[PDB]
Amino acid sequence: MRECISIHVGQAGVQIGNACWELYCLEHGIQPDGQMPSDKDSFNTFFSETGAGKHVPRAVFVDLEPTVIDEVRTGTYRQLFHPEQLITGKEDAANNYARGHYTIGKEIIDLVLDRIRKLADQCTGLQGFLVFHSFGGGTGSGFTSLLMERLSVDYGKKSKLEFSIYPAPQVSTAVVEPYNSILTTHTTLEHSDCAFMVDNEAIYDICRRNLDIERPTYTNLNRLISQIVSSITASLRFDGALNVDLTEFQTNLVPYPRIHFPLATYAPVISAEKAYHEQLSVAEITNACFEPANQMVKCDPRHGKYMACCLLYRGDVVPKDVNAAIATIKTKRSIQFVDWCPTGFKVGINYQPPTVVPGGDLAKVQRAVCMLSNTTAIAEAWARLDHKFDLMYAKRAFVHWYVGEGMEEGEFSEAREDMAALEKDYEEVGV
């Protein structure tokens, strides 16, 4: 196999990673103590093995404050991870990109690399890293951008994928979150090969609409996010022919290195209270992949053009029914590919139904689908973020907090200007 190391930065990256690794164990059949009964490899990309038969995740948890990681050190899966891979500081970045990148982040950046090096030396064929972090947090933005620069120097030919959390005012914690999201994007744009953005507002509205959760919490959001991250990384952990390694993620989803932000859509999402629902067909869940309500980022792909589209099915799915669903969707919907790409749809099928976590809000389904697509409509997400950035930066609001922590004010302009060039990268492709 080719191993994969997952990196979890900040509160958002740690709590989402905790929910993901709980789901990974229930999918592979791994007990919370790391023991897996005589199962019959592919799962070894995410799990190493000790001499006693213990399956330990290839994961690193980093945070500048210990409150969130201390929950993992005492939680249900506390005996699953290596204790030395749970790294904690004492004072967080205070929602300041400059603290996580320049001042506070430097005091622990070397220790994180030496711990990552220990997992790297254990691998026989390391292919890349998975980085989980938020955009708004000082650690998720400042420390992540710092870590991505170091990984490009010490690991030259290794891939790097991101699971980034897009800020949403419903469940946001800082007014300077638009600042940090722009600063971390400009500094990580050249060091990241493919980034899957998760809009908190999209996941928030899905929980209220489909799951009937009046006021969703971080628990409700993370369980749904982990259910989507699993469908994206299932091809790396199980047998298949589509997106079998990190290099294939770039080949299938990213035609040009700067536009490496694919859009993810998931279906079906059904509340657990409706255990006796009707099993939606392959054609029903495929048509739901083109509705804006099921997308992980709030945007309208009908207003953009397609450069790539992948379909990862899970469960009772007959391949002949997928082709009939694509032929109908090709002629029914207004799906416009760019003039320089083949209008084909890549299909991968895993014949196991998705695994639900006990205590979750999702019901069991016989078939589910996750579509990964690269459409120019995702530039709308950058446009809303750039508008909040320009409103505050015109008056230089909150800027003194950043320049007081080693950062220079000129970095604000070079980052915003890079976003303007990134916005025109989508316009030059699909007008």
Partner: protein, 431 residues
Amino acid sequence: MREIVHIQAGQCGNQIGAKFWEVISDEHGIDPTGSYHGDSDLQLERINVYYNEATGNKYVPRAILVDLEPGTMDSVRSGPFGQIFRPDNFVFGQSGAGNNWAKGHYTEGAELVDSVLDVVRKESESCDCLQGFQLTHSLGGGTGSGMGTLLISKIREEYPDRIMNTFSVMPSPKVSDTVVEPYNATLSVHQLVENTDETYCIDNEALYDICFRTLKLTTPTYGDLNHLVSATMSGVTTCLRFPGQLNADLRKLAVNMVPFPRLHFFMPGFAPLTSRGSQQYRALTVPELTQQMFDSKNMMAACDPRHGRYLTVAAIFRGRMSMKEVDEQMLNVQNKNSSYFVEWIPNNVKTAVCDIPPRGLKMSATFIGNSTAIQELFKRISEQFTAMFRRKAFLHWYTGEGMDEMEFTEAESNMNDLVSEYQQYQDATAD
């Protein structure tokens, strides 16, 4: 970000500071001897923020008591909680200040400032991870104004990376008709704009108007005024003392409330307004708490928010209530009063909910606002300062202690520049 060192200086500082410890000790379930008598684990979650753990099950406040007059030392020990304060933390000089800002800042207080710093270092080094300092004082007197600002400068140059917070009491002729108080207040504000991170303006003019016109108290006393202060200080520190989100620490609060370094003077609000032992307010709901929190009659500073524009707003709700209802009411006021919020700071309103309400109440709401309307307080003190300074009245009291006459002019020029800075962003548009 955990422990906070408390410091109280002067007559007003020790009076409002003693009431602060009496109120929060009843909320955490601490008797006058220091033994925990509560019945909730949340009372001991964040108790290390304001208390030090003694030998037994005793919690000692992290408070430092300073004053030039020895008389107030006897008044603190006469209080119900005078024995829980550390006898090592009592620093009292020989002669008072005599309502002279120069005696506390240059002569009498400059000799006593070294003995306090030794207590600050002894208290700060015993903290596992010091967060900052909070100071309670008045600005119209001599010690809390003169030595209070001197102690801030001496402590800040030794702890520059920490947070300096102040609860400053503004003078008013309605309560104390001492004509040299506009002198001491203006000289203090000249220091607060440079040496503090967060300053809560507790205006005696507003406290008097609330007791006289709303509470129907024809002869308001300091006990009636401090009842509003202690209730406000307990509310603004709710999330520093309980398992909370929103800010949770002083720096994250400062990043989300201070858009410009000089504009760090907050307008406290509170609702409902009850007398001492009256227990009158009862049928108070969520829509009414949100209404009164943004009303001029519930502001602890004599400033009408309708006259200016909000830069940042933080609200802390206390009691058993609906998170969905609090969110619907906060969004409604932001839409109803959208003309009173600046449009170039998106999502400038932070909302908080705490399940533990204060003593004698089930519903409570504390308002922390950074409004441009606070200039009406600074223009009121400046007008009284200019009326006195243009006649050179009692100027020999200050020059006789070593002050130069230019210190009054440069202090008069700073607050006028501060008022022009509030009016600057009050008229600014996003365009």
